[PDB]
Amino acid sequence: GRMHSRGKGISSSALPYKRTPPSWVKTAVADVDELITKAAKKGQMPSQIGVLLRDQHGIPLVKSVTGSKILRILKAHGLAPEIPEDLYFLIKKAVAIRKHLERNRKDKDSKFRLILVESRIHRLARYYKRTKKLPPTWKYESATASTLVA
Amino acid sequence: GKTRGMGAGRKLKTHRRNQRWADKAYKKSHLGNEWKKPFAGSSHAKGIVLEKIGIEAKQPNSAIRKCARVQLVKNGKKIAAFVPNDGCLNFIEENDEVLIAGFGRKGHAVGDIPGVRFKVVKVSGVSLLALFKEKKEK
Amino acid sequence: GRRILNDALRTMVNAERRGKATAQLQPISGVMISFLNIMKHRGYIKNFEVFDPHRVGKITVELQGRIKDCKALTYRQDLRATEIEKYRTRMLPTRQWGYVVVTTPNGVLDHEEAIRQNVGGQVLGYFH
RNA sequence: UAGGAUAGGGGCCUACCAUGGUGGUGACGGGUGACGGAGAAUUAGGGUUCGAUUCCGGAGAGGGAGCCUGAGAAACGGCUACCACAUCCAAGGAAGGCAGCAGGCGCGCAAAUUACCCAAUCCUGACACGGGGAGGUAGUGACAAUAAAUAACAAUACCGGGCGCAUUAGUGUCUGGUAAUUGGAAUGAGUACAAUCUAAAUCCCUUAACGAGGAUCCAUUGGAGGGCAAGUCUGGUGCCAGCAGCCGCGGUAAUUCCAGCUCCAAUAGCGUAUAUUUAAGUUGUUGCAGUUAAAAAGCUCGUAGUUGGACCUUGGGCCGGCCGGCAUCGCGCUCCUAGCCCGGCAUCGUUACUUUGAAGAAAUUAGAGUGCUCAAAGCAAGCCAUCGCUCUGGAUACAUUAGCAUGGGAUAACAUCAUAGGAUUCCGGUCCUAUUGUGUUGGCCUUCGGGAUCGGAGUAAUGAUUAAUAGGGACAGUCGGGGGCAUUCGUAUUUCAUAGUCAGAGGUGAAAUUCUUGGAUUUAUGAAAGACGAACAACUGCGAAAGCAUUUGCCAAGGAUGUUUUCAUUAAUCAAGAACGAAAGUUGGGGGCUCGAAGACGAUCAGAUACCGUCCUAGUCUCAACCAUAAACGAUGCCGACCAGGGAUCGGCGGAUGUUGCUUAUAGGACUCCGCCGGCACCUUAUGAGAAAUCAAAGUCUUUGGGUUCCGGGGGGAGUAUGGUCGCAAGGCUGAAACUUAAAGGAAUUGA
RNA sequence: AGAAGUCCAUUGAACCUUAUCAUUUAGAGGAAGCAGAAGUCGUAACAAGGUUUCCGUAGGUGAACCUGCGGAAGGAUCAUUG
Ligand SMILES: [Mg+2]
Ligand SMILES: [Mg+2]
Ligand SMILES: [Mg+2]
Ligand SMILES: [Mg+2]
Ligand SMILES: [Mg+2]
Ligand SMILES: [Mg+2]
Ligand SMILES: [Mg+2]
Ligand SMILES: [Mg+2]
Ligand SMILES: [Mg+2]
Ligand SMILES: [Mg+2]
Ligand SMILES: [Mg+2]
Ligand SMILES: [Mg+2]
Ligand SMILES: [Mg+2]
Ligand SMILES: [Mg+2]
Ligand SMILES: [Mg+2]
Ligand SMILES: [Mg+2]
Ligand SMILES: [Mg+2]
Ligand SMILES: [Mg+2]
Ligand SMILES: [Mg+2]
Ligand SMILES: [Mg+2]
Ligand SMILES: [Mg+2]
Ligand SMILES: [Mg+2]
Ligand SMILES: [Mg+2]
Ligand SMILES: [Mg+2]
Ligand SMILES: [Mg+2]
Ligand SMILES: [Mg+2]
Ligand SMILES: [Mg+2]
Ligand SMILES: [Mg+2]
Ligand SMILES: [Mg+2]
Ligand SMILES: [Mg+2]
Ligand SMILES: [Mg+2]
Ligand SMILES: [Mg+2]
Ligand SMILES: [Mg+2]
Ligand SMILES: [Mg+2]
Ligand SMILES: [Mg+2]
Ligand SMILES: [Mg+2]
Ligand SMILES: [Mg+2]
Ligand SMILES: [Mg+2]
Ligand SMILES: [Mg+2]
Ligand SMILES: [Mg+2]
Ligand SMILES: [Mg+2]
Ligand SMILES: [Mg+2]
Ligand SMILES: [Mg+2]
Ligand SMILES: [Mg+2]
Incomplete structure (x- = not known):
C-alpha cells in the first residue's frame, strides 16, 4: 500500500508485451534524440518529456523506439538535472508547505503533512547518497531550500 | 507474532x-528473599519453646x-509450630530444646491452621x- | 511484504484442499520451479507451465489430487547430513513417505537423494 | 619518542608530547548464600538445574605488607614488621600460626580413631639399604550402590472350586489354606579346631565339630472416603480431642479421630522436611497466548535492530561398471606435481553454509571383548600334557562454539562496469638493477630480462536485466461535513424598548421555594448580546487518531481512478527520539446568552449531605501558554499472499439504446443496464475455526515455521511503597516487596 | 674484609581527620494492607436492583457514594418506508 497512508490503489500503467516499436512508427532514433534534448534544454524533466512525446509526436515509449531510457539520453548529452526529479519535486512541495505554514501557525494538519514530506525527502536522499547520484555531503536545510529550486 | 529471523537470536x-x-x-528462587525467611534456606531449625498458645481453626x-x-x-x-498428635502438647514443656521442620507446601500454611x-x-x-508411640521416653 | 515459495506452496495447499484442478502462482522463480520438479518427479503433481508475459513471471500447475500438505520452512535452517533424521521425524508423517526439500550446492533436492549423495544444505520446505 | 627496570615483550615505571580509549552488539557500576573446567541430576527430542570435594588449571595458609636462601618461593610444618588473638614468666624476658593426619572447643539441621604400616603405588635424599599422617590397613559408618535369608517337600485331615461318574453324587485335582495339625529331609545366621588372608592382625573365600518346630533364629515403615491399592466390621469420643499435601472428616449410628481385628503397598527397608528435575505446550527456538478468560501502546512519523520481489547455462549429448573422464560456442601460464605434441596450475572479490580430514587428556558417558559363582564391578584372562610355557587383550565412538585445512558454489549476505582510468597477439621511450662472455673480485653499459611510468595502430557482437496487481515522483478530470484565515446567513434563548390586556404565571406524581395590579405569564414590531448550526442527516462521506455539518473567497495539503510518462528496489515494521491527541483541569487577558460542578434554599424520606424543583459560583465560548489522560473500543497493531456466494452503496473509469420539461444539433448533465479498480458496511452459508458466544477472516495450526513491533503468566496486596523522570499544580511515565488466599474468572444450559 | 649507627630513596603494613558509599539495627508520631470474629450504620452493585451500569476528569459528603462535562454498550434499542 501507500507509504504514508492506508490507501491501497493499484492504478498504474501497463506496458505491452511487444518490446519493439509499432509497425506505424516511422521516426528515426536521431530525430527523437533531438526532440528530447530540445525539450530538456527548455527546462522539461524526463516525465514531462515523455508526456510530450506520447501526446504530440506519437512516440509510445522512447525505450522501445530508441533503445535507451530518456534519463540515459539526457545524461549522455550532459543535460540531466543535478537534483533528481522526484527529489526535486519533494523539495518543492516541502518548500510550499513550509511557506504556507508561516502564515498559518495553528494549522496542525499541514504541520503533520510537512513532517511526512520531510520524512519522504530524507528517505529518498538516503537512497541517492547510497547510489552516488548526489554528493555524499548533500544535506537538506529547511532554511536554504528555496535557493536550489524555482 | 513471534520474531523468526535468522539473525534474531539476541531478540x-x-x-x-x-x-x-x-x-x-x-522469581521466588532467583530474587533472594528466601535468605530473609525464618529458616534462611534450611530444612530444619532448632529452637527454645517460649510459651504454648493454641489457635482456632478456620470457619468450616x-x-x-x-x-x-x-x-x-x-537467628533469634x-x-x-504445630505439635502433631493427640496429647503431644503435654510433652512440650517451657524452655526445652525443640527441632522444628516445615509443614509441607514450602512456606505456605497447611490445612485449617x-x-x-x-x-x-x-x-x-x-x-x-517415639513419645507418642511409647518407643522412647525423655 | 513478499517472500515467495510461501505464497506458491500455500496457494497450492488451498487449491488442492478445495479440489481445484488448476492453480496459478503469480510470482515465480527458479527456486519455485526447482521445487515443483521434485514434486513432479516424486509423483505429487501433474505437469505445469510457465507463462511469461514479461516480468517476474507466472505459472499454472495441474493438481493430481494426491498431495496432502506442502509448506515452507521459512527461516531456512542450516541442515547437515546427520540431522536430516531429526527434521524428518519432526516434520514428516512417517518413516515411509514424505519428503523434505533442501537446497544444496549440488542443486535443490529431496532429503533421500541428499543422503545418497552425502551433502547437507538449508531446508526449504516439505510435502507429503 | 628516549630511557630505567625485568629473565624478557609492554605505561611496567620516569621525562617530554599528542587527545585519546570503552560504551543499547550493554561499557562502567551492583548482586552472587560465584574458584573455572572435565563433569552431575533429570532427560522422546529441544531443554532445565547443579558443579566446595579425590583429575586438570588457579588461588590462600589469622589479615595485610616486605624479604633472605635458592635453578625455582614474594615460601609460611622460613624469616621481619604491623593489626587481631593468644601462650610460658623467677615481671627483666621468651615463644606463636592444624584451610596437613588424628583430636578438642564453638557454630550449627548437618559430618568418623588423639589406631597400625611403609607391605602395594609412587616421590625423595649422598641413597638398591633411610624417610614418607603422601598413600595403604584396620576402626566408626542404613551417604549412595550390588547380590540375597526369614522357609522347601510329603501324606493326613473340617473342608473349597474345575477336571474323572457329572447323572444323584460325591471329594481329588494343581493342593489354595485357619490349620501353635503329623513326618522326616535341606540349609546358613550364629559358635568355632584348622588352614588361608595380612607388613602384623582382621573380614571374606574353604572348613572339623556344634547350631531350626514355629511362642521361636518371632520384619518393618506407612496406609484402608476420593485422587490411590485396601473395611458401608467391632468398642470409645461427640465440631471435643484429633485427622487432613488438596477435596474434606468429627456437632450421639464417624467408611476419615482414638484402638482392636482384618485388609493394602513397598520390603531390609520405608516415612517426613527442604532444594531441584519431571509432570510444565503453566517460559513455548522446536512449542503457548493477547475480541469477551491475564494480555494490541490513543494515533502516526522515525534511527539503530530484524526482515526484504524477479533476473545472469551446467542446459542439449558421449563415456565406462552413484560417480569419474570429456565434448557443445571450456580468460592463460615460466615455476611443484609434468602423458607415450597430452589431463588435473598455483595469487590480480570476500564471507556465512555444507562436505571431508587433522589435532583434539584421562576418569565419566556410549560401546566391543571377557562366567569376579551372578550382579554392581574390574581390565582381565584363556589354553596347555589345564608339566620348564603358549596365545594374548588392554577396541571403537561422541565431543556444541571458536581456531587449521579440503571439495561444493544451490541458498543468503557484504563489496561493486557507465568518467571505459577496461582487457588486449604486438610494437620503444623516459630509467635502474647484471647472470652465463668478469676461470678472480667487482664494477656505470651494446642486442637482451624486469618494474613501472607511457604517446598510438590492434582486435571484439567492444561495454547499463527487466520495468513487480512493490514503492516514490509527474500529469488529467474529479471527489470529500479533511485543515487554516477572512467572510455570509438562520431561527431560537435571554435582556431592553414601544403598544395592548387583566389575575394569575411557573413547576410537579403532587406541591413548595419564585414572579405578580411599580402588570407577572401572553400578544405584536424592533434592537442588543453571546452561544448553537435543527429539519435534509443515511447500517453515507473525509481524516493518522482525537475529530469534522450555514455561504462564499483565498492558501497549502490528500486518497482513489486514468495513463504505451518518469526513477529503478529507493521497501515492511520499528529500541532512541519526535508531531498530534475528546472532556475535565491549571495561569493570565477577552467574554459572559444558555446550561451548570461547588453553594443556598424548596420538597421527599426514618434520615436524604441524593434522585425531583428554584436561584446560581467556577466552567461551558475565545486568545496565549500548559496538561497527555478516556469503555482514546472494532475491547481485534501494521505489511503481504490465498480462500465463497450475493445484493446494495460511495468515488473514478469503460461500454451499452432510450428518455428527458435540460442542449444553436450532438457531446454532455439527470435516470436505466453491464463491467473493472478502490472504500464504509451488510445478508446467506460451512468445506473451516473456536470453550462457546460468534467470526468470510477471529479461516489457510499437533498435517504446528511469510515479515515485524508491543504485550500476558492464578486471585489479591497494587498501579500501592520506594527511587528516577516530566508538570505551575492536579497529576503523567517507569514501577516492587512482605504478607495473604483455593479459587477469582469466560462462555453457554436448566431453574428461580 | 668489615659490625653498630646514619643519609636519601623505594615497597609499604598500621593509625588518625573529613567526605562518601554499602549493609544490618531504634524510634515519639502518622498512615496502610490482611486475616478473623454472632459488633455498628446504612443500601452502593447484581432485575429497568427500583436514579441503567461503567470510563476519564473535577468538586462535594458519616460510609457505601452524589453531581457537572465528554465518552462506551460490556443496554433495558441490532428496527420506521409503518
Ligand atoms: Mg496491494
Ligand atoms: Mg511505513
Ligand atoms: Mg621500550
Ligand atoms: Mg566464594
Ligand atoms: Mg563456601
Ligand atoms: Mg586441585
Ligand atoms: Mg602460596
Ligand atoms: Mg583458622
Ligand atoms: Mg607469606
Ligand atoms: Mg600447619
Ligand atoms: Mg584436623
Ligand atoms: Mg502395620
Ligand atoms: Mg491412620
Ligand atoms: Mg487415599
Ligand atoms: Mg480403591
Ligand atoms: Mg502429610
Ligand atoms: Mg474448601
Ligand atoms: Mg485418608
Ligand atoms: Mg482406623
Ligand atoms: Mg508456577
Ligand atoms: Mg497459558
Ligand atoms: Mg472484564
Ligand atoms: Mg481482558
Ligand atoms: Mg531501519
Ligand atoms: Mg512499476
Ligand atoms: Mg406585559
Ligand atoms: Mg455526503
Ligand atoms: Mg443547517
Ligand atoms: Mg445543592
Ligand atoms: Mg491508558
Ligand atoms: Mg486496549
Ligand atoms: Mg487501536
Ligand atoms: Mg459507480
Ligand atoms: Mg466494489
Ligand atoms: Mg503461572
Ligand atoms: Mg499474576
Ligand atoms: Mg455469566
Ligand atoms: Mg447489612
Ligand atoms: Mg442491617
Ligand atoms: Mg448507582
Ligand atoms: Mg440498590
Ligand atoms: Mg441504581
Ligand atoms: Mg444494569
Ligand atoms: Mg453533592
Missing part, C-alpha cells in the same frame, strides 16, 4: 530473559489447634513419634 534470548521474571517460581472446622511459640537459635526469630507453616518434630533430643 529471542533477551525476550525470554525478561519474561522469565513474570513466573512466580523463577471448629477446634483448638495446639501450637508452641519457639525462638530460633540461629519467633515462630509458631491459620498462619502456621512450621511443625515440631523433636523435643529434648527425642522424637515426638
Whole structure:
C-alpha cells in the first residue's frame, strides 16, 4: 500500500508485451534524440518529456523506439538535472508547505503533512547518497531550500 | 507474532530473559528473599519453646489447634509450630530444646491452621513419634 | 511484504484442499520451479507451465489430487547430513513417505537423494 | 619518542608530547548464600538445574605488607614488621600460626580413631639399604550402590472350586489354606579346631565339630472416603480431642479421630522436611497466548535492530561398471606435481553454509571383548600334557562454539562496469638493477630480462536485466461535513424598548421555594448580546487518531481512478527520539446568552449531605501558554499472499439504446443496464475455526515455521511503597516487596 | 674484609581527620494492607436492583457514594418506508 497512508490503489500503467516499436512508427532514433534534448534544454524533466512525446509526436515509449531510457539520453548529452526529479519535486512541495505554514501557525494538519514530506525527502536522499547520484555531503536545510529550486 | 529471523537470536534470548521474571517460581528462587525467611534456606531449625498458645481453626472446622511459640537459635526469630498428635502438647514443656521442620507446601500454611507453616518434630533430643508411640521416653 | 515459495506452496495447499484442478502462482522463480520438479518427479503433481508475459513471471500447475500438505520452512535452517533424521521425524508423517526439500550446492533436492549423495544444505520446505 | 627496570615483550615505571580509549552488539557500576573446567541430576527430542570435594588449571595458609636462601618461593610444618588473638614468666624476658593426619572447643539441621604400616603405588635424599599422617590397613559408618535369608517337600485331615461318574453324587485335582495339625529331609545366621588372608592382625573365600518346630533364629515403615491399592466390621469420643499435601472428616449410628481385628503397598527397608528435575505446550527456538478468560501502546512519523520481489547455462549429448573422464560456442601460464605434441596450475572479490580430514587428556558417558559363582564391578584372562610355557587383550565412538585445512558454489549476505582510468597477439621511450662472455673480485653499459611510468595502430557482437496487481515522483478530470484565515446567513434563548390586556404565571406524581395590579405569564414590531448550526442527516462521506455539518473567497495539503510518462528496489515494521491527541483541569487577558460542578434554599424520606424543583459560583465560548489522560473500543497493531456466494452503496473509469420539461444539433448533465479498480458496511452459508458466544477472516495450526513491533503468566496486596523522570499544580511515565488466599474468572444450559 | 649507627630513596603494613558509599539495627508520631470474629450504620452493585451500569476528569459528603462535562454498550434499542 501507500507509504504514508492506508490507501491501497493499484492504478498504474501497463506496458505491452511487444518490446519493439509499432509497425506505424516511422521516426528515426536521431530525430527523437533531438526532440528530447530540445525539450530538456527548455527546462522539461524526463516525465514531462515523455508526456510530450506520447501526446504530440506519437512516440509510445522512447525505450522501445530508441533503445535507451530518456534519463540515459539526457545524461549522455550532459543535460540531466543535478537534483533528481522526484527529489526535486519533494523539495518543492516541502518548500510550499513550509511557506504556507508561516502564515498559518495553528494549522496542525499541514504541520503533520510537512513532517511526512520531510520524512519522504530524507528517505529518498538516503537512497541517492547510497547510489552516488548526489554528493555524499548533500544535506537538506529547511532554511536554504528555496535557493536550489524555482 | 513471534520474531523468526535468522539473525534474531539476541531478540529471542533477551525476550525470554525478561519474561522469565513474570513466573512466580523463577522469581521466588532467583530474587533472594528466601535468605530473609525464618529458616534462611534450611530444612530444619532448632529452637527454645517460649510459651504454648493454641489457635482456632478456620470457619468450616471448629477446634483448638495446639501450637508452641519457639525462638530460633540461629537467628533469634519467633515462630509458631504445630505439635502433631493427640496429647503431644503435654510433652512440650517451657524452655526445652525443640527441632522444628516445615509443614509441607514450602512456606505456605497447611490445612485449617491459620498462619502456621512450621511443625515440631523433636523435643529434648527425642522424637515426638517415639513419645507418642511409647518407643522412647525423655 | 513478499517472500515467495510461501505464497506458491500455500496457494497450492488451498487449491488442492478445495479440489481445484488448476492453480496459478503469480510470482515465480527458479527456486519455485526447482521445487515443483521434485514434486513432479516424486509423483505429487501433474505437469505445469510457465507463462511469461514479461516480468517476474507466472505459472499454472495441474493438481493430481494426491498431495496432502506442502509448506515452507521459512527461516531456512542450516541442515547437515546427520540431522536430516531429526527434521524428518519432526516434520514428516512417517518413516515411509514424505519428503523434505533442501537446497544444496549440488542443486535443490529431496532429503533421500541428499543422503545418497552425502551433502547437507538449508531446508526449504516439505510435502507429503 | 628516549630511557630505567625485568629473565624478557609492554605505561611496567620516569621525562617530554599528542587527545585519546570503552560504551543499547550493554561499557562502567551492583548482586552472587560465584574458584573455572572435565563433569552431575533429570532427560522422546529441544531443554532445565547443579558443579566446595579425590583429575586438570588457579588461588590462600589469622589479615595485610616486605624479604633472605635458592635453578625455582614474594615460601609460611622460613624469616621481619604491623593489626587481631593468644601462650610460658623467677615481671627483666621468651615463644606463636592444624584451610596437613588424628583430636578438642564453638557454630550449627548437618559430618568418623588423639589406631597400625611403609607391605602395594609412587616421590625423595649422598641413597638398591633411610624417610614418607603422601598413600595403604584396620576402626566408626542404613551417604549412595550390588547380590540375597526369614522357609522347601510329603501324606493326613473340617473342608473349597474345575477336571474323572457329572447323572444323584460325591471329594481329588494343581493342593489354595485357619490349620501353635503329623513326618522326616535341606540349609546358613550364629559358635568355632584348622588352614588361608595380612607388613602384623582382621573380614571374606574353604572348613572339623556344634547350631531350626514355629511362642521361636518371632520384619518393618506407612496406609484402608476420593485422587490411590485396601473395611458401608467391632468398642470409645461427640465440631471435643484429633485427622487432613488438596477435596474434606468429627456437632450421639464417624467408611476419615482414638484402638482392636482384618485388609493394602513397598520390603531390609520405608516415612517426613527442604532444594531441584519431571509432570510444565503453566517460559513455548522446536512449542503457548493477547475480541469477551491475564494480555494490541490513543494515533502516526522515525534511527539503530530484524526482515526484504524477479533476473545472469551446467542446459542439449558421449563415456565406462552413484560417480569419474570429456565434448557443445571450456580468460592463460615460466615455476611443484609434468602423458607415450597430452589431463588435473598455483595469487590480480570476500564471507556465512555444507562436505571431508587433522589435532583434539584421562576418569565419566556410549560401546566391543571377557562366567569376579551372578550382579554392581574390574581390565582381565584363556589354553596347555589345564608339566620348564603358549596365545594374548588392554577396541571403537561422541565431543556444541571458536581456531587449521579440503571439495561444493544451490541458498543468503557484504563489496561493486557507465568518467571505459577496461582487457588486449604486438610494437620503444623516459630509467635502474647484471647472470652465463668478469676461470678472480667487482664494477656505470651494446642486442637482451624486469618494474613501472607511457604517446598510438590492434582486435571484439567492444561495454547499463527487466520495468513487480512493490514503492516514490509527474500529469488529467474529479471527489470529500479533511485543515487554516477572512467572510455570509438562520431561527431560537435571554435582556431592553414601544403598544395592548387583566389575575394569575411557573413547576410537579403532587406541591413548595419564585414572579405578580411599580402588570407577572401572553400578544405584536424592533434592537442588543453571546452561544448553537435543527429539519435534509443515511447500517453515507473525509481524516493518522482525537475529530469534522450555514455561504462564499483565498492558501497549502490528500486518497482513489486514468495513463504505451518518469526513477529503478529507493521497501515492511520499528529500541532512541519526535508531531498530534475528546472532556475535565491549571495561569493570565477577552467574554459572559444558555446550561451548570461547588453553594443556598424548596420538597421527599426514618434520615436524604441524593434522585425531583428554584436561584446560581467556577466552567461551558475565545486568545496565549500548559496538561497527555478516556469503555482514546472494532475491547481485534501494521505489511503481504490465498480462500465463497450475493445484493446494495460511495468515488473514478469503460461500454451499452432510450428518455428527458435540460442542449444553436450532438457531446454532455439527470435516470436505466453491464463491467473493472478502490472504500464504509451488510445478508446467506460451512468445506473451516473456536470453550462457546460468534467470526468470510477471529479461516489457510499437533498435517504446528511469510515479515515485524508491543504485550500476558492464578486471585489479591497494587498501579500501592520506594527511587528516577516530566508538570505551575492536579497529576503523567517507569514501577516492587512482605504478607495473604483455593479459587477469582469466560462462555453457554436448566431453574428461580 | 668489615659490625653498630646514619643519609636519601623505594615497597609499604598500621593509625588518625573529613567526605562518601554499602549493609544490618531504634524510634515519639502518622498512615496502610490482611486475616478473623454472632459488633455498628446504612443500601452502593447484581432485575429497568427500583436514579441503567461503567470510563476519564473535577468538586462535594458519616460510609457505601452524589453531581457537572465528554465518552462506551460490556443496554433495558441490532428496527420506521409503518
Ligand atoms: Mg496491494
Ligand atoms: Mg511505513
Ligand atoms: Mg508456577
Ligand atoms: Mg621500550
Ligand atoms: Mg566464594
Ligand atoms: Mg563456601
Ligand atoms: Mg586441585
Ligand atoms: Mg602460596
Ligand atoms: Mg583458622
Ligand atoms: Mg607469606
Ligand atoms: Mg600447619
Ligand atoms: Mg584436623
Ligand atoms: Mg502395620
Ligand atoms: Mg491412620
Ligand atoms: Mg487415599
Ligand atoms: Mg480403591
Ligand atoms: Mg502429610
Ligand atoms: Mg474448601
Ligand atoms: Mg485418608
Ligand atoms: Mg482406623
Ligand atoms: Mg497459558
Ligand atoms: Mg472484564
Ligand atoms: Mg481482558
Ligand atoms: Mg531501519
Ligand atoms: Mg512499476
Ligand atoms: Mg406585559
Ligand atoms: Mg455526503
Ligand atoms: Mg443547517
Ligand atoms: Mg445543592
Ligand atoms: Mg491508558
Ligand atoms: Mg486496549
Ligand atoms: Mg487501536
Ligand atoms: Mg459507480
Ligand atoms: Mg466494489
Ligand atoms: Mg503461572
Ligand atoms: Mg499474576
Ligand atoms: Mg455469566
Ligand atoms: Mg447489612
Ligand atoms: Mg442491617
Ligand atoms: Mg448507582
Ligand atoms: Mg440498590
Ligand atoms: Mg441504581
Ligand atoms: Mg444494569
Ligand atoms: Mg453533592
